[PDB]
Subunit: 312 residues, 3 copies
């Protein structure tokens, strides 16, 4: 059955994966279908036989253990091989020289780089598929895929859901990517954020265009929480505020702990792309609704399906 | 035959491997039996087919090439897959967040961490087996296993042996772990150490309880050496002494070179957990009795058998 | 057919690969033959089944992504396993201790080390084959092999060729190694270099002995370029010159860009061992004659064949 799905046509095949804007609702539906079978296969066989003759390089100019190890494990559980490039402390060879070098060894490269334009360098020069693992934190498409997959799997549907984004919605680009992916579905969105860290006007206008913008609030109210199906939290960082007083104030209001979960639904899904500071208290980690570690498991099967589609 | 042994019941199966205190004489006998077959299998096939669908993460917060590469090679020679997590220079994500992340990718994690309590964090939070590769140097259970295996294999038995521990017996915790493992057998122990760096009273009292304590000496005498079956050396570090004069004095007395081996038995086994400074001179490396590199080979088969038992 | 070639006798089998001076014209002919089949196999199967039960360690004391990842990918595309040792920032264990440790885990080690004498340490102490990935930049034998292979493959022959070495021919040791490998063939050599950075007298005298030295020039003339079949460029580094003025002067004269390629042949092969600074302009990267990335692909198949011969 996975064989049939992977034989089906896809925009992923032999393609760079650089932006969520490349892919359709149909593309993601197939990805999630294959992801579902990837999980069943792994439960049965552990290491599958899909990409046995393929080699993936991972090329992370800044470390992200959660992302790089996810791709390594996905590739190896597809039966493929991985070559993780040591992240140097360096000044060094140009990105395009390194990519063209590694393209002689591997069939695809996962690239994470602090320059947003790194995706344009990859497009111009790299003769094998490049998967964007983070381009100056502008986009992180497989994080967007796994976030959406997490919602679908935790709550079973997409229609009728209310999603509450809380924290730094200006710098929290995973929110923007997920807002783009949500344009097809009949959802409602609540934006809880300091006034300084609200969504960029273009992303807000995306929600307006879709008839999805429900409420905008500085405060994480019992009322907002009471109607939340998905509480998607972002990291609030001190550099976003000139004064410490304001920074700690906003943190204390937004901290997700038992004091705030008591206003949520029994079925609210608490999500966080991670790393976290203290915006989600450790005391809630064992709560049913704490889904930010299931998120990582969902990402494995999503990236297995992505790698299968790209390199098969 | 390995298949039969691995089908046999074991305390290792699906278990954390955190302390030598978890396991019995029977547990270790089975481990060593399987280790013996692991060596035969490797000699015949190089890479076996025991853990083909399993994935091991190695998570070393401080480097130990001898330990991490041993586990990587053992896992891969079992036919499994390995994901070695780059040791960062970092301040970073909490240990429990990282473990729960990597548990979504792998079936077991080998963890080395500078906090002794890291084993308690792993117990509370990690939903897959964690193997302790060193917890603030308090314990290193697979080092204890391979040390004991080395003795069994080099000398053929455990009964009637005299073991001489030399060096820093206060901070040299591999000695303490091995003393615990030796409680079942009819051995005699000689402790050669500066008075400041003698065994902790509890560990000494362990030897007394077992009727194994033979002699305690500041000097590495021709008499002590003449009755030594196993000379287990530890690193003496300058920080253990306020003055340089005392540090160099103790080093010169304890240095194992041809000048000191001439008093040993033709069959004395010279062991060292490594890394070494100068307490074992390079001139003895090619001597039959120099077993600290065979130790590493023995560790490979011991860790192959451990990984097989835990994850099969 | 690869099976027959690999069954054929070879100086590579079970041997250290430390210097180009170890191997004959016959040895290299077989290597290149096998390399050719390695490429066909990879095109068909991606990952072959030649070294399925073998384990390669890569041990790089200074990073060289192009070299270490090439060996990793070659080993894995032979169906073998790889254990890449993290390059530390460290003061640490002696080289011989580390090698003897890793020899207990792997069947061969690729070693790159800043001490030229590291090859002598490996010879004395390491009980498995060591492949020299760079010994204080004195030798880099597999780079020499792939350079020669690149010429053979790009131009089809070795007889009648004119090779032009340009840049730092004093510190550019890949030139010296390639000059040694070229002693069998009827080639002519042009040496374009500043007078301070000319070839060492012994290497020049090698070319004289072989009846291959054609011309020595400070300037990269239209005449020299017009007769060049292979333009092998080396990096010119500022430390080679006391004054910046001279350094930039020599760089501007030697920079390979369209302004200089217009004097070359339509068939001139532009080679560079890499990394490059600006001595080969990015504008020529898409030119047919720009072979420094095909070089890397050729290196993969060369190292596949080398690893097959050593460890089969």
């Amino acid at each position: 059955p996975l064989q049939e799905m992977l034989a089906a046509p896809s925009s992923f095949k032999k393609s760079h994966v650089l932006s969520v804007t490349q892919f359709t609702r149909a593309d993601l539906h197939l990805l999630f279908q294959i992801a579902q079978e990837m999980r069943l296969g792994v439960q049965r066989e552990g290491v599958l036989d899909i990409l046995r003759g393929k080699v993936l390089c991972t090329l992370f100019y800044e470390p992200s253990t959660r992302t790089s190890a996810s791709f390594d494990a996905a590739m190896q559980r597809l039966g493929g091989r991985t070559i993780p490039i040591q992240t140097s402390t360096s000044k060094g060879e140009t990105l395009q020289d390194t990519l063209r070098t590694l393209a002689c060894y591997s069939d695809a490269i996962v690239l994470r780089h602090p320059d947003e334009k790194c995706v344009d360098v990859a497009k111009k020069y790299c003769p094998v598929p490049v998967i964007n693992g983070g381009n100056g934190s502008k986009e992180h498409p497989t994080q967007a895929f796994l976030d959406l997959f997490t919602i679908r799997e935790e709550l079973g549907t997409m229609q009728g859901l209310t999603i509450t984004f809380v924290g730094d919605l200006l710098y929290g680009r995973p929110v923007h990517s997920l807002v783009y992916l949500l344009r097809h579905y009949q959802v409602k969105v609540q934006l809880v954020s300091p006034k300084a860290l609200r969504l960029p006007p273009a992303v807000r206008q995306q929600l307006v265009d879709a008839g999805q913008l429900l409420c905008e609030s500085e405060a994480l109210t019992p009322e907002i929480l009471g109607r939340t199906d998905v509480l998607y939290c972002t990291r609030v960082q001190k550099e976003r505020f000139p004064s410490l007083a304001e920074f700690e104030a906003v943190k204390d209001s937004y901290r997700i702990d038992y004091s705030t979960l008591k206003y949520a639904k029994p079925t609210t899904v608490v999500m966080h792309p991670l790393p976290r500071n203290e915006e989600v208290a450790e005391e809630v980690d064992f709560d049913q609704r704490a889904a930010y570690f299931r998120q990582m498991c969902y990402g494995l099967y999503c990236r297995m399906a992505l790698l299968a589609l790209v390199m098969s």
